[PDB]
Amino acid sequence: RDEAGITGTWYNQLGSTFIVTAGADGALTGTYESAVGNAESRYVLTGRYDSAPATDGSGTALGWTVAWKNNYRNAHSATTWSGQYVGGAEARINTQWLLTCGTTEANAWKSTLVGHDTFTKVK
Amino acid sequence: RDEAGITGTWYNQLGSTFIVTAGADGALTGTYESAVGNAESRYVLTGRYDSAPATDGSGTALGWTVAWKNNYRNAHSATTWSGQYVGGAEARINTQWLLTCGTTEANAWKSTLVGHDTFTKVK
Amino acid sequence: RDEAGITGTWYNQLGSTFIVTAGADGALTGTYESAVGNAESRYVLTGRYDSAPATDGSGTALGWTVAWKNNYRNAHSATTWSGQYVGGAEARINTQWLLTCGTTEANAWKSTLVGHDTFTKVK
Amino acid sequence: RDEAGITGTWYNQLGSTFIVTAGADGALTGTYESAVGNAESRYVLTGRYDSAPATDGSGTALGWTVAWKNNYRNAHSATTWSGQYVGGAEARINTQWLLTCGTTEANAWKSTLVGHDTFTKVK
């Protein structure tokens, strides 16, 4: 169980900062600050994680959401990251993500970006 | 603003049930019960949504996460749905989703499923 | 084996037309005309399919690519559809797709759209 | 135009080998050998690429498909990679991919894996 491992400040390859607390129950709460896109300052995030992972060297599944609205901007969009926490000398959170924009029904086909972020405790 | 529109009980094409409350602030809280997979009964969900969408007929971006652990099972996985709420006579939540399993670093390549769920207020 | 089942003219939910020949060997060749986006007229497509599927009622895996350049336009992008052919009274090709735009390394994070198309022999 | 840049032997982070020829017209033809999964030896691949990319430092969009059937195995599946070729001292092909298995209509929800491969000319 990785409540301790997860909780803290994480940085991705784009220079984004994800600050999270992991609850005993499975909760994830925090703030996200994106280095790119139509974003400034911190945005609320929430999510979930597996509080009793397999003990066989598997990763810890988890995910979280950011809606890109805060007191400064509203980018009419939401990203969800789905992935796994891997512990040990160089801990990582390896994710894939889906960003959906609010669109008209005619432009729905082009509503959703897909990418992959890797989070580390350093840089 | 679709706090009212979102809040409630939603059903997808697989026969799953998503029960959600949308907060004034952007919060989503609730429970998910999957008709398929390594799942039984209700699982906690949390997420976010755009509480002040565009007024130009665009959808309302949102997302949420379920970690597949509850008092009955632990499937060592998490799904995130990213999508948009569309209001009006036949309201829908149109999503794409990422399901990550906890895996060894050797099997990480096969950790993540992708699909699409459409939620309605009826069936 | 669905060489016969696949070959022909298919229409998706956006009103696009996919014309394909399936070879005995696994080849797919054809043309795609998109109802949406930065596209006009026909574009070359190529792909592959499983020429000896399982006989247990499973679908037939397949995929194909379109690069969005032809004599009329160049949208500096490529879509790949991955999915399965399901035969029988109402045959379908159920796909998920990835559209990558050519971008600068700074905008790479926003290079890739994800969606889902369902192809039928009618409409 | 990157006919020359693309053509050749490429290696990904899993230790897979992708051997490709790029045609003047936009064609990609070749063979793929996977380091992982239900695969052995070479499999046919085909695809497309943008033969006249933007000259503004953008990448070259492209994609390709492998159906996982050859003389040795049939894994009743197909992968499509969608991405972009980036040229220059350390050329890369940055991809995201969708792997669809042939499934029953009941298991269709779990038919499709998503991941990301980065290809280089060395290792």
Q: What is the DSSP letter of C122?
A: -
| SS3 of residue A106 by DSSP | helix
Question: Which pair of tokens denotes residue A81?
Answer: 């990251």
Which residues in chain D are contacts of B14 at CB distance < 8 A?
A: 109
Residues pairing with C9 in the sheet: C19
Name the residue among B92, B10, B80 with its Cα closest to residue A114. B80
Which H or E run includes D3? helix D3-6
Q: Are B14 and B43 in contact (CB under 8 A)?
A: no
Nearest to C115 among A14, A37, A109 (CB): A109
Cα(D93)–Cα(C108) distance, rounded to whole angstroms? 12
- Best C38, C109, C110, C114 member to test A by mutation, with max A CBs in 10 Å, is C109
Q: CA of B83, closest CA in chain C: separation in Å?
A: 11
What is the SS3 string spanning chain B?
CCHHHHCEEEECCCCCEEEEEECCCCEEEEEEECCCCCCCCCEEEEEEECCCCCCCCCCEEEEEEEEEECCCCEEEEEEEEEEEEECCCCCEEEEEEEEEECCCHHHHHHCEEEEEEEEECCC
Q: Are C93 and C62 in contact (CB under 8 A)?
A: yes
State how far the Cα of C44 lies from the Cα of D46, in Å rounded to an integer.
12
Rounded (10°) CA dihedral D28, D34, D35, D36: 140
User: Which of C36, C106, C110 shows the shortest C-beta gap to A113?
Assistant: C110
CB D78 within 8 A of CB C53: no
CA distances from A49 to A119, B102, D16 (A): 15, 10, 32
Phi, psi of A32 (to 5 degrees): -130, 140
Structure tokens at B16: 């799953």
- Could you give the CA distance from residue D4 to residue B95 in angstroms, rounded to a whole number? 40
> What's the resolution in A?
1.7
Beta bridge partners of D43: D32
Q: Could you tell me if A32 and A17 are in contact, meaning their C-beta atoms sit under 8 angstroms apart?
A: yes
Chain D residues near any Cβ of chain B (below 8 Å): 14, 36-37, 98, 106, 109-115
Q: Testing the interface with B: which of D109, D111, D112, D116 to mutate, by most B Cβ within 10 A?
A: D109
What span, in angstroms and rounded, lies between the C-alpha atoms of B83 and B6?
Answer: 13
Cβ-Cβ contacts under 8 Å, A118 against chain C: none
The tokens describing D32, both together, are 């793929």
What is chain C's length? 123
How many Å apart are CA C17 and CA A112, to the nearest integer?
A: 22
CB pair distance less than 8 Å for A112 and C112: no
Cβ(A69)–Cβ(A59) under 8 Å?
no
Strands D43-49, D27-33: parallel, antiparallel or unpaired by DSSP?
antiparallel
* B93, C85, C101 from C33: Cα distances, Å: 29, 19, 18
Report helix, strand or coil for D110. Answer: helix
Work out the angle at residue C4's Cα, subtended by the Cα atoms of residues C2 and C10, and round it to the nearest 5 degrees. 95
**CA-CA distance, C16 to C60, in Å (whole number)?**
21
| D96 neighbourhood in chain A, CB within 8 Å | 114-116
Residue in C closest to A98 by C-alpha = C114
Task: Name the 3-class secondary structure at A15.
Answer: coil
Phi-psi region of B88 (alpha: psi -120 to 50; beta: other; left: phi over 0): left
Nearest CA among C73, C71, C95, C101 for reference residue C83:
C95
Element (H, E) at A6: helix A3-6
Q: CB–CB of A113 and C113 under 8 A?
A: yes
* DSSP states of D34-77: -SSSS--S-EEEEEEE-SS--SSS--EEEEEEEEEE-SS-EEEE
Q: At C115, is the secondary structure helix, strand, or coil?
A: strand
Interface test with B, best of A21, A49, A56, A80 (most B CBs within 10 A): A80
Q: Which CATH superfamily is domain A1-123 in?
A: Avidin-like (2.40.128.30)
State how far the Cα of B52 lies from the Cα of A71, in Å rounded to an integer: 12
Give contacts of B116 with chain C, Cβ < 8 Å.
Answer: 96, 116
How far is it, in rounded angstroms, from Cα D7 to Cα D23? Answer: 9
> Are B75 and B43 in contact, with CB atoms under 8 Å apart?
no
User: Which of A98, A102, A97 minimizes the C-alpha distance to A75?
Assistant: A102
Q: Of C37, C106, C114, which is closest to A114 when you measure between CB atoms?
A: C114
Report how far residue C33's alpha carbon sits from residue C11's, in angstroms, rounded to the nearest whole number: 10
Query: Which residue is listed with tokens 């060749």?
Result: C29
d(CA B26, CA A82): 20
Domains of chain B, by residue range, sit at 1-123
